[PDB]
């Protein structure tokens, strides 16, 4: 709950070594966990918030020109001088132009002249750094089984709300009864901060890195202006105009906001007006479960006439739920939900609400349930055999494992060995799994990065030609691997 | 002992630059930031900005941007304050005082504090009209 | 920015009175926080520094209290010489803002 609809979904199981598992999760999906006890919990992830700020850089992005000075010594006795370019606020260049007696002066040369001019600026780009501090991850952790009103709404208290920063530990949760969690975040291996750039407009703002946003044009300027109006840049803006000989001008080169934009292409974007809303990135849990009850075993199978008040409801791959309410004295009771085949019975299903209860009296419990591939009948009464209901999952055994093979894919792409993080209680496998794509994916690191979608495609096809060359059998460290990483992160990049 | 002293109160002209001094006794003069506080009469107290007197950066806040300037003697241990621009509203009691020093430059807050903003050391006052 | 609400705006109490200011903060600020006296027209005085505690030479009839947002400050036992305007001040972020005041009168 709070999860349903909200596709790409990160289902979890195994609980071994004891309780821990680690999950890593991020701002667009969210997780669900599952284990032979201990009952299915939702891991969605709102809100990031990094409290303090400081400011490194203002850029001016408009500019205007006054007080337009500027002189012309005479023909090669003298290079012009001006009292006005002693300010640095002041924009000047030196020129040549030609001076005759036409002019006035004498000796008829290509003589050197100055232009001047006060620099004044407009709306700004206010760049801020953070440290990895000074930040707070909100995850809201809620539980299934039950509770109508929605098994979205995100908005509304039944989750928890805890918060996590770098200066905290083991974010001990507590539930409705049974839901002692505590979770271990490891927000120092997230976005890796210190190679962190927010940079804000008159509106807006985008998260891009350091070396980008220090290496870009448009006046430099330091984050002790107050007073200031110091830029240490300018050719990059004002432009000067010479024509053929005479006299040279001054011209503001206009705003570059819609260039700036276009410059910030390929970055992710933040509302930033609370002091900050940070948004999308991800985080890394270690979770220990011990500490939980199922609501209660405590309880009975129930007596039975039920009644069904939703429809088959069908989400993503098998996830499929049914709103049932309760007709009766059930002094609450268990819900005795069962997956079932045909005749001579084969059941063979799960339910993914472990232990479903009914609350006080009437009210429209809901239970979310994993038929197989195909024919289903999913069955909720007991003794007249209540109510059964038959259900066709269309799926395949090996299209779901092909589906699976593309999001372990995608793994593989975005997120990175924190995605080999993802599962748990690998023990010697996927630690080794993690340090051979920790040391493979930091030779392919910066280390040919910084290209765009073309020529990261381009780049593939070439050397996987020369790869299918065939040298001496490095044709497969050659061609089949690296055909097969550039290709499929070439075409899942850029989003 | 612990003490400022402050210059005399001034009447200026709109659109021209008044200064006031600040002078410093009782201490070691590089142990301690300095900062300019006004006072509308009609109004509570406001922050202008802030100097240091070991090396001499400064700050100021985004309501006197390019308006303030801020200088000093080592020799004499005194800060001038300079605003320009002056116009009606800057009509004000200013105001200057002690930070207790993160040792190398200005504007920090994680040491524990200011400690003050600004009444310890501050001094006498100087009162500011701008006028025809 | 960070909006500092000094509450109430002016108060009168008679002399040995306790009295109680609060001051919020629209973000957290969390012990940095001052509190001064102001004699009208005259030299002022720093009561509370940290938000809880004594300046050396302060009588100890002033205190201060709170962590988060939310401020007390508290004057145990009214004195005629108290009449002054007094302020709360964060410290934290540095565009820094004063609290707006608070009057008093003596009954």
């Known amino acids: 709950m709070r999860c349903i609809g909200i596709s790409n979904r990160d289902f979890v199981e195994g609980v071994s070594g004891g309780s821990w598992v680690d999950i890593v999760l991020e701002h667009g999906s969210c997780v669900t966990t599952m284990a032979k006890n201990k009952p299915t919990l939702d891991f969605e992830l709102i809100k990031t918030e990094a409290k303090h700020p400081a400011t490194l850089r203002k850029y001016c992005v408009e500019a205007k020109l006054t007080n337009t000075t500027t002189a012309s010594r005479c023909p090669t006795q003298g290079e012009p001088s001006l009292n006005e370019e002693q300010d640095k606020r002041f924009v000047c260049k030196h020129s040549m132009v030609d001076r005759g007696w036409g002019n006035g002066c004498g000796l008829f040369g290509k003589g050197g002249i100055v232009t001047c001019a006060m620099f004044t600026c407009k709306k700004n780009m206010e760049g801020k750094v953070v440290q990895p501090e000074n930040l707070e991850y909100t995850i809201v952790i809620t539980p299934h089984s039950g509770e109508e009103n929605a098994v979205g709404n995100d908005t509304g208290k039944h989750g928890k709300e805890i918060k996590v920063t770098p200066q905290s530990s083991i974010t001990e949760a507590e539930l409705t009864g049974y839901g002692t969690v505590t979770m271990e975040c490891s927000p120092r291996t997230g976005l890796d901060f210190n190679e962190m750039v927010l940079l804000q407009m008159e509106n807006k703002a985008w998260l891009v890195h350091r070396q980008w946003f220090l290496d870009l044009p448009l006046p430099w300027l330091p984050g002790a202006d107050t007073q200031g109006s110091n830029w240490i840049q300018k050719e990059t803006l004002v432009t000067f105009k010479n024509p053929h000989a005479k006299k040279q001008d001054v011209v503001v080169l206009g705003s570059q906001e819609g260039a700036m934009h276009t410059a910030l292409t390929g970055a992710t974007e933040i509302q930033m007006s609370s002091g900050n809303l940070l948004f999308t990135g991800h985080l890394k849990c270690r979770l220990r479960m011990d500490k939980l009850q199922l609501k209660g075993m405590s309880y009975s199978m129930c007596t039975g006439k039920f009644k069904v008040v939703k429809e088959i409801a069908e989400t993503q791959h098998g996830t499929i739920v049914i709103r049932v309410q309760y007709e009766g004295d059930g002094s609450p009771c268990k819900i005795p939900f069962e997956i079932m085949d045909l005749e001579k019975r084969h059941v063979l299903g799960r339910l993914i609400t472990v232990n479903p209860i009914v609350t006080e009296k009437d009210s429209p419990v809901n239970i979310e349930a994993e038929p197989p591939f195909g024919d289903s009948y999913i069955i909720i009464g007991v003794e007249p055999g209540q109510l059964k209901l038959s259900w066709f999952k269309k799926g395949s055994s090996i299209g779901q494992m092909f589906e699976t093979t593309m999001r372990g894919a995608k793994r593989m792409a975005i997120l990175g060995d924190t995605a080999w993080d993802f599962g748990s209680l690998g023990g010697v496998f996927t630690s080794i799994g993690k340090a051979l794509h920790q040391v493979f994916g930091a030779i392919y690191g910066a280390a040919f990065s910084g290209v765009s979608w073309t020529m990261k495609i381009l780049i593939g096809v070439v050397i996987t030609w020369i790869g299918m060359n065939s040298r001496s059998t490095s044709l497969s460290v050659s061609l089949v691997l690296v055909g097969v990483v550039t290709l499929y992160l070439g075409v899942m990049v850029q989003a | 002992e612990v003490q400022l002293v402050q210059s005399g109160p001034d009447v200026e002209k709109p659109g021209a630059s008044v200064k006031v001094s600040c002078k410093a006794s009782?201490?070691?003069?590089?142990?301690?930031?300095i900062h300019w506080v006004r006072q509308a009469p009609g109004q509570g107290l406001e922050w202008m900005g802030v100097?240091?007197?070991?090396?001499?950066?400064?700050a100021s806040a985004q309501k006197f941007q390019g308006r303030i300037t801020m200088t000093r003697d080592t020799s004499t241990s005194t800060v001038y304050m300079e605003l320009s621009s002056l116009r009606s509203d800057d009509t004000a009691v200013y105001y200057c005082a002690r930070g207790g020093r993160a040792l190398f430059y200005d504007s920090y807050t994680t040491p524990r504090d200011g400690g003050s903003w600004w009444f310890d050391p501050w001094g006498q006052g100087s009162l500011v009209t701008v006028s025809s | 920015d960070i909006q500092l609400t000094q509450s109430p705006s002016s108060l009168s109490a008679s002399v040995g009175d306790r009295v109680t200011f609060t001051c919020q903060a629209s973000?957290?600020?969390?012990?940095?926080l001052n509190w001064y006296q102001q004699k009208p027209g005259k030299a002022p005085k720093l009561l509370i520094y940290?938000?809880?505690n004594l300046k050396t030479g302060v009588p100890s009839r002033f205190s201060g209290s709170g962590s988060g947002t939310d401020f007390t400050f508290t004057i145990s036992s009214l004195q005629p010489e108290d009449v002054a305007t007094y302020y709360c001040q964060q410290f934290d972020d540095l565009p820094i803002t004063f609290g707006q005041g608070t009057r008093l009168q003596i009954k």
């Open positions: 100097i240091n007197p070991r090396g001499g950066s400064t």
């Open positions: 973000q957290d600020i969390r012990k940095y």
């Open positions: 940290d938000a809880s």
């Open positions: 009782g201490y070691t003069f590089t142990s301690n930031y």
